[PDB]
Design a protein around this motif. Structure first.
Motif, PDB file in Angstrom:
ATOM      1  N   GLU A 139      86.165  72.634 -27.314  1.00 13.88           N
ATOM      2  CA  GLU A 139      86.747  73.243 -26.059  1.00 13.88           C
ATOM      3  C   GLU A 139      87.929  74.016 -26.241  1.00 13.88           C
ATOM      4  O   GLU A 139      88.978  73.586 -25.462  1.00 13.88           O
TER       5      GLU A 139
ATOM      6  N   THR B   8      80.532  69.286 -25.863  1.00 14.48           N
ATOM      7  CA  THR B   8      81.063  70.442 -25.100  1.00 14.48           C
ATOM      8  C   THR B   8      82.436  70.071 -24.650  1.00 14.48           C
ATOM      9  O   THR B   8      83.284  71.075 -24.853  1.00 14.48           O
ATOM     10  N   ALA B   9      82.912  68.764 -24.593  1.00 16.79           N
ATOM     11  CA  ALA B   9      84.294  68.398 -24.163  1.00 16.79           C
ATOM     12  C   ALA B   9      85.070  68.454 -25.599  1.00 16.79           C
ATOM     13  O   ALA B   9      86.040  69.036 -25.578  1.00 16.79           O
TER      14      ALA B   9
ATOM     15  N   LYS C 238      70.987  72.976 -30.028  1.00 21.23           N
ATOM     16  CA  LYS C 238      69.944  72.556 -28.828  1.00 21.23           C
ATOM     17  C   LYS C 238      68.542  72.784 -29.316  1.00 21.23           C
ATOM     18  O   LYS C 238      67.748  71.775 -28.607  1.00 21.23           O
TER      19      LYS C 238
ATOM     20  N   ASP D 232      74.568  63.670 -27.857  1.00 18.22           N
ATOM     21  CA  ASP D 232      75.241  63.680 -26.573  1.00 18.22           C
ATOM     22  C   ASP D 232      75.760  64.828 -26.460  1.00 18.22           C
ATOM     23  O   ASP D 232      76.698  65.383 -27.311  1.00 18.22           O
ATOM     24  N   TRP D 233      75.565  66.124 -25.496  1.00 18.39           N
ATOM     25  CA  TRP D 233      76.079  67.234 -25.554  1.00 18.39           C
ATOM     26  C   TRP D 233      77.377  67.457 -24.619  1.00 18.39           C
ATOM     27  O   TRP D 233      77.888  68.362 -24.578  1.00 18.39           O
ATOM     28  N   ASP D 234      77.499  66.580 -23.753  1.00 17.27           N
ATOM     29  CA  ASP D 234      78.589  66.474 -22.780  1.00 17.27           C
ATOM     30  C   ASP D 234      79.742  66.001 -23.480  1.00 17.27           C
ATOM     31  O   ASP D 234      80.977  66.743 -23.634  1.00 17.27           O
ATOM     32  N   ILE D 235      79.703  65.176 -24.715  1.00 17.79           N
ATOM     33  CA  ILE D 235      80.796  64.866 -25.494  1.00 17.79           C
ATOM     34  C   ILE D 235      81.028  66.120 -26.678  1.00 17.79           C
ATOM     35  O   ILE D 235      82.246  66.229 -26.888  1.00 17.79           O
TER      36      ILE D 235
END
Length: 1044
Positions: free
Chosen positions: A458, A454-455, A440, A449-452
């Motif tokens: 996992e 982190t998904a 980061k 994109d950090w949501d993708i």
């Protein structure tokens, strides 16, 4: 244009679609392969083009079907086996598979005769039972390997399945020859000879071609495709020659060949090994797909035209009775199977009863019955019943065996496995969080994109009275998570002792895995060590003992007796015969007389003018054996007079004189006895030392396994004794654990020393192999770390990797018994005597060999040091004040005593007859004063004793950082002693110094804040050191620079 390529490609595509679509469903892909084959068959019954394709493929000859599909499946079943766990329970697997197959085939034959409305006799019913009794469980083996414990049960099931398939095809071939293709009659003696020929020369031919294949694979370097093609051609040629040319059971030959090739996987290169594993798995998958597709096509084309409601009723009753018969077989053999080392429980018996999945083998046998029967309905009934049994067993047994493994309690994850998996998942999640926080704050990877992310990153936990047990286990933990001071209670003391024993066993398992991961332990040695550890972890208060670990290095058996008996069996004409070429020449004459012996035998059997009057008396008996080997090279005295081998050589020559007077008379039995006795005696004389080499190889393998187990236990005990202070808090439990660990260490060290003393040359050979393997592994590590740093490109590093892999493969083909070196070679190969040859000559002139028998004391505890003792033979015991240790051949006693001029520390007593090289202290002082170059004798001796005294300090301080003893010693070997006389007897600790240890004397540190007198590693808080020059101290320190 071959349509068989189109059908094979379509079957491969359908198998790929079946494997891809049915990943989540519990139904196996073979059942929907049969469904797709049935759909393709009825389409072919409608459409003429698909009729042409399935007609030229699925209506195949039985013999080519067997010769193509059976070797692949049988060799992959034999090659996917874990052969060590299979041979550890070989007796139980063999008796269960053989006797259960025989009695289950008999019971299935009786069931078929008493149940089926067709008027089958006993032979066709026995063929039916032989087809039905063949089980091929693969989903059960995969589920048993996946679901944690009961790892031995999967090996039992797989070995029983392999032997069941082999002997089922054998008895199927026997009853097929009884029923269908021949109808010839024979006497009882010919039947006994045929049964002996099959059941003996199957495995014997398999063993012979397996040994030939192993010998061919051992001498192939830097050639993978030759090894792959040699394995495939060896399997196919073994099955073809055994089944067709030798008229023997080829299936048992491929079973034995696959088991031996899987046993000797060290002769194959590891990349070729994993490629062979994947390649044979792929070949078995393709063979299974082809068999199931062809079976479905022929079932829905020909076997489904003769079937009534009574046939389906008989199929259901046959499935129920087959399950009942297998359960009754396992129940009746349960006490016999219980009296082995691995007795079956009732849960394992129920699993093996329900794990009877019929596979492609019985379908192939039903296919060759259907094609062999012709227009008769017996093959149609066979094929229909086998297809129905296969479908029912696959679907019902697979789904209900997943349910049954869930129900019976054999699928629960153990608490240490759950804790280790949860800790690994927590560590991976923490590392991913640290990596995310690193990314980061990046330059390029900041707009991502950090949501993708982190998904996607996992990875979670696979494992998502038991509560009372977990609460009690967490309750016995007086650790850092709760700070309450108290006093020990006796029940609390027993709980703390049990917890400390469990922590000791777990840390020993961790040390064994760390030894295996660094290329030190063997695979079987690691498996045996963790087996002993997990056995000791299940008892009340039993640690990992010495008595159950002594069985690994038990060299006793038939092999030392064979070695001793053979070495007792064998132990200017002399100058001519000593040239070791006359024996080779006469052996060439023997092996070139072997072929006319066979020619004379077959010609006398048949009876060319009788092959020119029997090759003119066999070249006049090879010119009467080259004129009796030029009259035994003109005769040699007592050397010919005392040897009994020369006595039957004289017997051979006078038997040749009997042949000469027989030709003078010019009987056939006399000629036969002449040739047979000559060839057998003169071959035995040459084949004795090859048997000696084979016996030496077997003893070498057993000794290698035992030495690996002992060394792994010693290194694991050293690591677990160096990490014992953190995990154990109480003093008394710590002292008791250290006492039992040091007694076990002393017992294992003494046992390994006596094991080395029992067989000297083979111990020298296995030590040489271990040393060369360690040197090549560290060289490979150096090549890998040079490639990873960018200093060497990929192609040159691959060339060096190929060179060290060729060296490792040639190390695998080592002599099994290197002869032991003389004591002069041991005096040459001292660590501080390696380089200078003049120092070697001076020490050799100044040495003295001394003999000490059992019970004599070499050196006392309180007397002054009078010199060194290089042990060249025997085992000694060092008892000091309590310091106990056993030293063996190659160790030097009194180095620090002769360096520091101090009185000795331990009493050296003999456990065997001990030969030592006693270099005097005056001679060592003269050699020290004479040799004063930049590598000096003072520097080398102090470097050796500095490494020896500095490895436990570094291993103690850096135990928690995951450093082994080998890595600590290799890191210490890069160091050097500092000549303190140059720098005014003061040394400054810089940032380049990685670890600094003061070896001898006293030293003052920093701004004279304190004094470091003891030999220990100097702490980071010390910036500078000052050394004093005093009487009889000579302060020396060992520093290690960092990597430059």
């Amino acid at each position: 244009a071959p349509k068989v390529i189109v059908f094979i490609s379509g079957s491969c595509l359908f198998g790929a679609i079946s494997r891809s679509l049915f990943k989540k469903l519990p139904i196996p892909y073979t059942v929907v392969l049969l469904i797709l084959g049935a759909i393709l068959g009825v389409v072919a019954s409608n459409v003429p083009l698909v009729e042409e394709h399935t007609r030229d493929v699925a209506h195949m000859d039985p013999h080519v079907l067997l010769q193509i599909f059976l070797p692949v499946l049988i060799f992959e079943s034999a090659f996917a086996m874990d052969v060590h766990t299979f041979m550890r329970s070989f007796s139980q697997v063999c008796i269960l598979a053989l006797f259960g197959l025989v009695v289950a085939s008999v019971l299935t034959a009786v069931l078929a005769m008493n149940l089926f409305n067709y008027n089958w006799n006993f032979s066709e019913a026995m063929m039916f039972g032989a087809i039905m009794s063949a089980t091929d469980p693969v989903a059960v083996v995969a589920l048993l390997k996946d679901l944690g414990a009961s790892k031995q049960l999967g090996t039992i099931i797989e070995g029983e399945s392999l032997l069941n398939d082999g002997c089922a095809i054998v008895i199927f071939n026997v009853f097929m020859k009884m029923v269908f293709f021949p109808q010839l009659t024979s006497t009882v003696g010919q039947n006994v000879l045929y049964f002996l020929q099959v059941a003996v020369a199957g495995p014997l031919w398999g063993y012979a071609v397996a040994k030939v294949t192993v010998f061919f694979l051992s001498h192939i370097f830097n050639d993978a495709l030759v090894e792959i093609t040699i394995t495939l051609a060896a399997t196919y040629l073994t099955y073809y020659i055994g089944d067709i040319w030798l008229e023997v059971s080829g299936v048992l030959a491929v079973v034995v060949l696959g088991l031996i090739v899987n046993a000797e996987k060290t002769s194959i290169s590891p990349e070729v090994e994993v490629f062979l594993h994947r390649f044979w798995e792929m070949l078995a998958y393709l063979a299974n797909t082809l068999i199931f597709m062809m079976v479905g096509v022929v079932v829905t084309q020909k076997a489904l035209v003769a079937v009534d409601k009574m046939d389906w009723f008989y199929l259901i009753i046959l499935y129920l009775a087959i399950t009942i018969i297998r359960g009754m077989v396992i129940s009746l053999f349960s006490p016999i199977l219980s009296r082995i080392g691995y007795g079956l429980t009732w849960r394992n018996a129920v699993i093996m009863t329900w794990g009877g999945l019929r596979g492609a083998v019985g379908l192939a046998l039903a296919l060759v019955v259907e094609n062999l029967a012709g227009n008769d309905v017996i093959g149609s009934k066979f094929l229909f019943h086998t297809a129905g049994i296969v479908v029912l067993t696959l679907v019902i047994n697979a789904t209900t065996i997943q349910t049954l493994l869930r129900i019976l309690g054999m699928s629960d994850i153990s608490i240490p496995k759950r804790l280790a998996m949860a800790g690994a998942v927590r560590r991976i999640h923490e590392g991913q969080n640290r990596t995310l926080n690193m990314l980061k704050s990046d330059r390029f990877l900041a707009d991502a994109d950090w949501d993708i992310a982190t998904a996607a990153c996992e990875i979670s936990d696979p494992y998502s009275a038991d509560e009372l047990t977990l609460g009690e286990r967490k309750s016995v933990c007086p650790g850092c998570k709760a700070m309450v001071p108290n006093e020990p209670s006796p029940r609390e003391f027993a709980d703390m002792m049990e917890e400390a024993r469990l922590r000791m066993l777990k840390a020993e398992k961790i040390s064994y895995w760390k030894q295996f991961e660094h290329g030190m332990l063997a695979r079987e040695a690691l498996r045996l060590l963790v087996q002993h550890a997990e056995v000791a972890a299940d008892e009340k208060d039993q640690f990992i003992l010495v008595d159950d670990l002594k069985k690994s290095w038990q060299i006793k058996g038939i092999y030392p007796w064979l070695k001793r008996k053979l070495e007792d069996l064998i132990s200017l004409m002399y100058k001519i015969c000593h040239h070791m070429a006359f024996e080779v020449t006469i052996n060439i004459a023997i092996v070139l007389n072997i072929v006319p012996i066979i020619m004379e035998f077959v010609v006398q059997d048949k009876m060319q003018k009788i092959e020119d009057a029997l090759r003119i008396s066999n070249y006049v008996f090879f010119v009467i054996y080259a004129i009796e080997a030029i009259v035994k090279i003109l005769g040699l005295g007592r050397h010919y007079i005392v040897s009994h081998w020369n006595k039957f050589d004289a017997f051979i020559l006078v038997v040749a004189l009997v042949d000469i007077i027989i030709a003078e008379t010019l009987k056939v039995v006399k000629l036969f006895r002449l040739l047979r006795g000559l060839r057998m005696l003169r071959l035995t004389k040459a084949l004795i030392p090859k048997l000696i080499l084979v016996v030496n190889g077997k003893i070498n393998n057993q000794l290698s396994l035992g030495y690996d187990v002992g060394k792994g236990y010693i290194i694991g005990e050293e690591e677990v004794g160096k990490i014992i202070d953190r995990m154990v808090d109480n003093k008394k439990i710590l002292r008791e654990l250290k006492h039992i660990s040091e007694t076990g260490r002393l017992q294992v060290v003494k046992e390994l020393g006596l094991l080395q003393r029992e067989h000297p040359g083979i111990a020298v050979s296995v030590k040489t192999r271990q040393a060369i393997r360690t040197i090549l592994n560290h060289s490979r590590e150096t090549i890998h770390e040079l490639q990873g740093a960018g200093l060497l490109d990929e192609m040159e590093a691959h060339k060096l990797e190929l060179t060290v892999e060729i060296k490792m493969k040639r190390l695998m083909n080592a002599p099994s018994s290197i002869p032991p070196p003389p004591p002069e070679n041991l005096l040459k190969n001292v660590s501080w005597l390696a380089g200078d040859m003049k120092l070697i000559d001076f020490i050799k002139a100044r040495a003295s060999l001394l003999h000490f028998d059992y019970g004599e004391v070499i050196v006392r505890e309180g007397d002054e040091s009078d010199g060194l003792f290089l042990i060249v033979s025997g085992l000694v015991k060092l008892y000091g004040k309590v310091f106990e240790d056993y030293l063996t051949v190659g160790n030097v006693i009194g180095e620090m005593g002769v360096l520091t001029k101090k009185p000795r520390n331990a009493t050296v007593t003999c456990e065997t007859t001990v030969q030592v090289y006693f270099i005097t202290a005056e001679d060592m002082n003269i050699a020290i004063d004479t040799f004063t170059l930049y590598p000096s004798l003072e520097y080398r001796l102090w470097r050796v004793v500095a490494i020896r005294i500095a490895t436990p300090l570094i291993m103690e301080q850096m135990a928690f950082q995951g450093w082994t003893q080998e890595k600590v010693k290799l890191h210490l070997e890069r160091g050097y002693l500092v000549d303190l006389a140059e720098s005014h007897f003061q040394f400054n600790i810089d940032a380049t110094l990685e670890d600094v240890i003061l070896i001898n004397g006293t030293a003052y540190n920093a701004h004279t804040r304190e004094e470091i007198r003891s030999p220990c590693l100097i702490s980071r808080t010390v910036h500078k050191l000052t050394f004093q020059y005093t009487a009889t101290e000579e302060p020396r320190l060992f520093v290690v620079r960092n990597a430059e």
